[PDB]
């Protein structure tokens, strides 16, 4: 609720990894970022294999635990955390100044970062984070 | 199989020595297995009223002795519950030697039989003197 | 025993029968097949070329040869063609069958050393290459990958 984001990024039809890499770099530069429409973010590849990887991550675990997100919400956030030294003071600060959202709770329409957009007209092998979450068992709350 | 129409607490195990309630020449029977039954680790296979059990003859006529035959449990000391909640128990444990078709190998059944055994083995029942 | 044990040419040449005794006989039946009465006076000449230097036990030679010639009876027992296996198993091979003590093994067989690009087999046929098939079956029973090569034959 209420997040003074210095930047609002729209993930719709963008390559999650390429967005994250840039959101990571900016948060470490002191920027407060908000990723919007996570559910509509995309990742290239053969859906069958992609899903296997994420399903494996869900299954992995033990008493110590391996909490892996299923909602496109966290999936995206965990992706970013993997690009930050989240256990260091600086890293945790940067990570905590970044939040991912389902849809867009803001008024402004986020901006699209360069080199992160995927042309649906010249690409058929890719998937939606939302599709992944539905496969994982998430509750489509979007 | 068909519902006995009564709940049973198996009062017998593999190895139990019971009475042969018929005139086949077999007096004592030793339970070896219970038809259609599979137990669980360390559990002694159990048998009660209305079960078809494989058996061996411990006592009786030389020709009948040592033979491995099939039979049906007709009576057991351990109580059984009937639909109206009443419990029913007998004076001893007994079984009647049967064949492939489940027809008594003998001609006459000695002692009473539980009514429930009828709803399963007709020819055994229709050979009963007393059916409690 | 597996070819894994003797297919490599990493050991010294060991062929001096004047210093080695008890060498098993070869299982290879013949080297000249078909019409050996006639000389290579045929239109077509196909060859099976080994693509890697390897050692081929007389075991595989016999199996490779039989599988090919036995099949070349798509032409008949007295068919018009001649088949040649030009290599001979000169390399004596041992086995250490005590543990690693006094391990010089004892003679257990023989193998032929073939260098990549040599032809092990050579057939001579009239435009009737059933031989090309006799070979798909032959390089099936020898360690290396192989090249089926046709020399005199512009009748494609």
């Amino acid at each position: 609720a209420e997040f003074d984001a210095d930047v609002i990024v729209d993930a719709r039809d963008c390559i999650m990894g390429r967005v994250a890499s840039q959101v990571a770099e900016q948060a470490l530069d002191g920027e407060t970022v908000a990723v919007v429409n996570a559910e509509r973010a995309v990742i290239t590849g053969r859906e069958e294999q992609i899903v296997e990887k994420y399903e494996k991550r869900v299954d992995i675990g033990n008493d110590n635990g391996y909490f892996y997100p299923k909602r496109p919400d966290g999936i995206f956030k965990r992706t970013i955390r993997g690009m930050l030294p989240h256990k260091k003071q600086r890293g945790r600060e940067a990570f905590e100044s970044v939040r991912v959202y389902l849809g867009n709770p803001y008024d402004e329409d986020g901006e699209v970062l360069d080199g992160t957009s995927l042309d649906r007209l010249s690409n058929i092998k890719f998937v939606t984070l939302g599709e992944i979450s539905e496969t994982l068992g998430a509750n489509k709350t979007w | 199989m068909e519902a006995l129409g009564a709940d049973v607490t198996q009062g017998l195990e593999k190895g139990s020595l019971i009475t042969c309630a018929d005139n086949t020449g077999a007096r004592e029977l030793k339970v070896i297995s219970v038809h259609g039954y599979s137990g669980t680790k360390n559990r002694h296979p159990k048998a009660g009223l209305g079960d078809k059990i494989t058996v061996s003859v411990t006592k009786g006529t030389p020709e009948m002795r040592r033979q491995v035959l099939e039979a049906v449990v007709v009576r057991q000391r351990k109580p059984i519950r009937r639909p109206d909640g009443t419990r029913v128990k007998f004076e001893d444990n007994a079984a009647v030697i049967v064949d492939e078709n489940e027809d008594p190998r003998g001609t006459e059944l000695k002692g009473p039989i539980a009514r429930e055994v009828a709803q399963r083995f007709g020819s055994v029942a229709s050979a009963a003197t007393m059916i409690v | 025993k597996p070819g894994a044990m003797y297919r490599n040419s990493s050991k010294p040449a060991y062929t001096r029968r004047e210093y080695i005794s008890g060498i098993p006989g070869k299982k290879i039946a013949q080297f000249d097949m078909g019409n050996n009465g006639a000389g290579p006076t045929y239109p077509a000449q196909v060859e099976l070329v080994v693509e890697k230097p390897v050692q081929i036990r007389h075991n595989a030679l016999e199996a490779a040869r039989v599988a090919a010639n036995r099949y070349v009876q798509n032409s008949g027992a007295a068919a018009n063609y001649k088949f040649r296996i030009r290599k001979f198993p000169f390399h004596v091979i041992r086995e250490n069958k005590d543990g690693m003590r006094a391990p010089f093994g004892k003679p257990v067989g023989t193998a032929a050393r073939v260098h990549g690009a040599n032809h092990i087999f050579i057939a001579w046929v009239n435009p009737d290459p059933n031989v090309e098939e006799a070979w798909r079956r032959a390089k099936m029973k020898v360690t290396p990958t192989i090249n089926i090569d046709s020399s005199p034959a512009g009748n494609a």
Partner: protein, 172 residues
């Protein structure tokens, strides 16, 4: 590459985005035609399928898009029809259309009715031991015909002996 399909006088074909719709006296069929770098557009009197690439995979889809469109043309005018024949040896098989699904009863004596739901605007008119599956959407019709046949599939016993079932008699 580029191919041009002159649309039939009897038909009108509109398309926005990756969806093409074809309407004729016999109906309307809308399809999604999505493939990397292949543009499908209605240029007045002709539908155009074109792409800047010519690799095998591309040509394959182009040809596929074409037949898909022509098939739509045909379905909105002449339509598509599959003819089927119910057949039984001992048990009189009863095939009826109830709702949006064809039901089959007494198959090989079965007490439980076997059924299948019809696809789209496909009409399954049954007359005696003859069935006629028809509609403007070849996809839908073709499946409904198939499903009907599949519905009598048997794996348990020798098919050569137990031949009962409904079969596709005439393919369009």
């Amino acid at each position: 590459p580029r191919v041009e399909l002159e649309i039939p006088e009897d038909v009108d074909a509109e398309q926005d985005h990756l969806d093409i719709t074809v309407e004729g006296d016999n109906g309307s069929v809308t399809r999604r035609l999505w493939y990397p770098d292949i543009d499908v557009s209605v240029d007045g009197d002709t539908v155009v399928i074109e792409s800047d690439e010519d690799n095998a995979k591309t040509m394959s889809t182009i040809g596929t898009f074409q037949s898909h469109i022509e098939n739509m043309f045909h379905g909105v005018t002449e339509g598509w029809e599959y003819g089927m024949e119910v057949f039984y040896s001992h048990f009189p098989m009863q095939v009826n259309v109830e709702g949006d699904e064809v039901v089959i009863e007494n198959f090989l004596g079965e007490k439980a009715p076997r059924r299948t739901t019809i696809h789209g605007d496909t009409d399954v008119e049954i007359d005696g031991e003859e069935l006629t599956v028809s509609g403007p959407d070849i996809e839908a019709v073709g499946q409904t015909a198939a499903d009907i046949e599949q519905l009598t599939r048997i794996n348990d016993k020798d098919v050569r002996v137990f031949q009962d079932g409904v079969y596709i008699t005439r393919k369009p």
